[PDB]
Amino acid sequence: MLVRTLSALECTKVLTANRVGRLACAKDGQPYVVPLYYAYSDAHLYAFSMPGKKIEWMRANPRVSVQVDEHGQGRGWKSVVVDGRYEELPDLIGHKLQRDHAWSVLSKHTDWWEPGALSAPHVFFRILIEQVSGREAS
Amino acid sequence: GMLVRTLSALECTKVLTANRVGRLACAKDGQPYVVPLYYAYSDAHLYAFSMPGKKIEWMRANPRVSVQVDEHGQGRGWKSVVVDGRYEELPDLIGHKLQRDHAWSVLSKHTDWWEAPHVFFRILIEQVSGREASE
Numbered sequence A: 001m002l003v004r005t006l007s008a009l010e011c012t013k014v015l016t017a018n019r020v021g022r023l024a025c026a027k028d029g030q031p032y033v034v035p036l037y038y039a040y041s042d043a044h045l046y047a048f049s050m051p052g053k054k055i056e057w058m059r060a061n062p063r064v065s066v067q068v069d070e071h072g073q074g075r076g077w078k079s080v081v082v083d084g085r086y087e088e089l090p091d092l093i094g095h096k097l098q099r100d101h102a103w104s105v106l107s108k109h110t111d112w113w114e115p116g117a118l119s120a121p122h123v124f125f126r127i128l129i130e131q132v133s134g135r136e137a138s
Numbered sequence B: 001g002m003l004v005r006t007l008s009a010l011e012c013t014k015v016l017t018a019n020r021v022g023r024l025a026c027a028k029d030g031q032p033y034v035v036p037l038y039y040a041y042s043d044a045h046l047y048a049f050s051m052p053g054k055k056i057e058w059m060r061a062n063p064r065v066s067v068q069v070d071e072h073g074q075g076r077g078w079k080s081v082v083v084d085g086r087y088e089e090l091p092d093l094i095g096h097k098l099q100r101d102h103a104w105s106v107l108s109k110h111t112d113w114w115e116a117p118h119v120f121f122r123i124l125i126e127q128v129s130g131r132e133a134s135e
C-alpha cells in the first residue's frame, strides 16, 4: 500500500462526506472512546447526546480526538484524525438555529441509537476542529 | 427510539472475537488520540502489531487505553464493545512467541492493508462493557 498524508483540503472532504466517527475523551489519564454520528459545518462537528459518561467527562475535560474514515477502491481507505475541543451548546435562543439545523440532519440517525422510553432532553454540542491530519492507503 | 440494552461481559467477548477492527484511544496529558487498529482477541487481552510512531510512544508513557469495537445487527441494529485497557509491550521472547504467532496468523493479510521493527503488543482488558440496539 502506498500510504501518504492528506492535504488540509483532502481532510475536510473526508469529514464533510461522512457521518460517523469515533470520539475519544479522557479523565485522569484514562481514555474513553465511543461511536458518534456527527454533521460537519464551519470547522465544527455537531452532534447530539443523551446525558451520560462521555458528556460528563467532556464537561470536565474538553480535550477530545475524533477519527473518521471511509473506503476507497479495493482495500483502499482514507482516515482523518481531529484534535478538538468540546463546546456544549445550551438550549438558549442564540443556539436555536444551530440546534434546529443540526437536528434536522441528525434526526433520522438519532433514531438509530437513542434509547426509547421503557431535541429537548438532548445535549447538543460541537467539536471545534483545532488540528487535523489525514492518511490514505492505495 | 431504539431498544437498547447493556451486554453481559460474555456477550462482549463474542463481539470481540467476531471482529478484527477497533479504534484505539491513548492519551497524553489529558489529550486523547484515536486511530483504527486491527487486533486479535485472546483470553484477557487484545493483541496487535504496529510500526513505531505516535500511538506506541504515547502508550509507553501512559499505558491506559480504550478500545472500541462494533458490528451491525438486524436492520438498523448494532452491538458495540468498549474495553478499558492497559498497554503492554511484548518483546520477542519465547514466552510470548505462541501469542505472537497466533496473532499474526489471524492478522497477516489485514496488515497488508495499512502496511524496520514491528512492535508487538497487547492490551489487558481491565473493564469491558457493551451495548446492543434493536429496532
Ligand SMILES: Cc1cc2nc3c(=O)[nH]c(=O)nc-3n(C[C@H](O)[C@H](O)[C@H](O)COP(=O)(O)OP(=O)(O)OC[C@H]3O[C@@H](n4cnc5c(N)ncnc54)[C@H](O)[C@@H]3O)c2cc1C
Binding pocket: A020, A034, A035, A036, A037, A038, A047, A048, A049, A050, A051, A052, A053, A054, A055, A113, B070, B078, B080, B081, B082, B129, B130, B131
Ligand atoms: C453508529 C452509532 C452512532 C452513534 N451516535 C451517537 C450519537 O450521536 N450520540 C450519542 O449520544 N450516542 C451515539 N451512539 C451511542 C454511543 O456510542 C453510546 O453508546 C451512548 O451515547 C452512551 O454513551 P455514554 O457515555 O453516555 O454511556 P453511559 O450511558 O453513561 O454508560 C456508561 C457505560 O456504558 C458503556 N458504553 C456506552 N456506550 C457504549 C458503547 N457504544 N459500546 C460499549 N460500551 C458502551 C461504557 O463503557 C460505560 O461502562 C451511537 C452508536 C452507534 C453504534
Ligand SMILES: Cc1cc2nc3c(=O)[nH]c(=O)nc-3n(C[C@H](O)[C@H](O)[C@H](O)COP(=O)(O)OP(=O)(O)OC[C@H]3O[C@@H](n4cnc5c(N)ncnc54)[C@H](O)[C@@H]3O)c2cc1C
Binding pocket: A069, A077, A079, A080, A081, A133, A134, A135, B021, B035, B036, B037, B038, B039, B048, B049, B050, B051, B052, B053, B054, B055, B056, B114
Ligand atoms: C482498517 C485499518 C486497520 C489498521 N490497522 C493497523 C494496525 O493494526 N497497526 C497499525 O500500526 N496501524 C493500523 N492502521 C493504521 C493506523 O490507523 C495509523 O494510521 C498508523 O498506525 C499510524 O499511526 P501512528 O500513531 O504511528 O502515527 P505516526 O506515524 O506517528 O503519525 C502521527 C501523525 O499522523 C496522524 N495519523 C496517524 N494515523 C492516522 C490515521 N489513521 N488517520 C489520520 N491521521 C493519522 C496523526 O494524527 C499525527 O498527525 C490501520 C488503518 C486502517 C484504516
Ligand SMILES: [Cl-]
Binding pocket: B070, B071, B072
Ligand atoms: Cl459488521
